[PDB]
Ligand binder design. Structure first.
Ligand SMILES: Nc1ncnc2c1ncn2[C@@H]1O[C@H](COP(=O)(O)OP(=O)(O)NP(=O)(O)O)[C@@H](O)[C@H]1O
Ligand SMILES: [Mg+2]
Ligand SMILES: [Mg+2]
Lengths: 17, 338
């Protein structure tokens, strides 16, 4: 519920470390 | 007892196909590569057609050298072992599997609709009846996967495929793991991590129910509930325990999300005494016919554009690159197990 930014709406990538 | 014995019989088929996994059962010349459906550092996913049967399938190729390099063999071990031992209408069917020089292969049923991510982003946001339709399939899938001691650990619209009739086909089992107690592997996606995974503590199957609460939120609003400019701010919001709902969220949806997105592990739905029936009996699923969803008798609120077979209109063309083959077997000793 904030100001939407295009980077957060892109395809998210999984990870593991 | 009618559903208690069905899952009990499903655990038998699992443990049977689990102890003695399948073996290589095709050749790469049986399927020609039509177009690339996806790609990545570990490998690629191509749309191939059966030259001996005349039908299309989804061939996921994984570069054997790169898998050894990226420290992911065990994830390819479990993903191949789980995808052959499970069977569910909402899980993908591994039709064929065969190892080769420089590559490993997995022929899965071709899902013609692509990721849910693209449709959600294109449409903007789903309606609550539209999202309730997709959430129910995840609940019945998590109920069946949890009965087999499996944790998915990576629920997000990028790994949810919409089949030809509007139903969900789950694909990515990279972080899937059969475990009875707890686990401590930090994996997933920042926006979907449960607060215990963030605090570097031990977590159980309840993290799959936190992801369901985030997933329902993103489908009904068009954006995840925890997003920020830096990943550290996202981890701060998740553990804080504050969620702001949009104006158009129904009061029943706000209640179900408050139970799913519960930082307190002792109050989170799905991890209580009544188990999965905490969620299926909620007032939000009060229009959902669960047996009709499983039998796939409910009309889908959305059908992917499938005017003809072989159309990748819902996927992205990317760049088409052939697979590099070697004369020297790049198969490591661990790849024998596959
Ligand atoms: N059975 C299938 N039918 C249709 N498309 C598929 C199928 N399996 C995979 N894909 C496509 O291939 C893409 C990659 O899937 P996936 O197995 O998650 O790759 P990955 O190893 O997880 N890399 P990542 O992009 O981070 O998920 C998916 O997003 C789909 O577009
Ligand atoms: Mg994935
Ligand atoms: Mg993955």
């Amino acid at each position: 519920r904030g100001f939407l930014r295009s980077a957060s709406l892109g395809r998210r990538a999984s990870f593991h470390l | 007892n009618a559903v208690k014995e069905f899952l009990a019989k499903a655990k038998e088929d699992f443990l049977k196909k689990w102890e003695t996994p399948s073996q290589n059962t095709a050749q790469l010349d049986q399927f020609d590569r039509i177009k690339t459906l996806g790609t990545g550092s570990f490998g690629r996913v191509m749309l191939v057609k059966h030259k001996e049967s005349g039908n299309h399938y989804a061939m996921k190729i994984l570069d054997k050298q790169k898998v050894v390099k990226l420290k992911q063999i065990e994830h390819t071990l479990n993903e191949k072992r789980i995808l052959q031992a499970v069977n569910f209408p909402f899980l993908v069917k591994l039709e064929f599997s065969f190892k080769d020089n420089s590559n490993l292969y997995m022929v899965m049923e071709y899902v013609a609709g692509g990721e849910m991510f693209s449709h959600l982003r294109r449409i903007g946001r789903f309606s609550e009846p539209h999202a309730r339709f997709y959430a129910a399939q995840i609940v019945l899938t998590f109920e069946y996967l949890h009965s087999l001691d499996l944790i998915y650990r990576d629920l997000k619209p990028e790994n949810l495929l919409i089949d030809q009739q509007g139903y969900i086909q789950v694909t990515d089992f990279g972080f899937a793991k059969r475990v009875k107690g707890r686990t401590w592997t930090l994996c997933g996606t920042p926006e979907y991590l449960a607060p215990e995974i963030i605090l570097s503590k031990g977590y159980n199957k309840a993290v799959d129910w936190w992801a369901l609460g985030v997933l329902i939120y993103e489908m009904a609003a068009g954006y995840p509930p925890f997003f920020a400019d830096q990943p550290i701010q996202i981890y701060e919001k998740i553990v804080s325990g504050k969620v702001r709902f949009p104006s158009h969220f129904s009061s029943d949806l706000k209640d179900l999300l408050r139970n799913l997105l519960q930082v307190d592990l002792t109050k989170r739905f799905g991890n209580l005494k009544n188990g999965v029936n905490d969620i299926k009996n909620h007032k939000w699923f009060a229009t959902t016919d669960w047996i009709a969803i499983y039998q796939r008798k409910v009309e889908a609120p959305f059908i992917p554009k499938f005017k003809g077979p072989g159309d990748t209109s819902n996927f992205d063309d990317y760049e088409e690159e052939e697979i590099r083959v070697s004369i020297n077997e790049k198969c490591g000793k661990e790849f024998t197990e596959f």
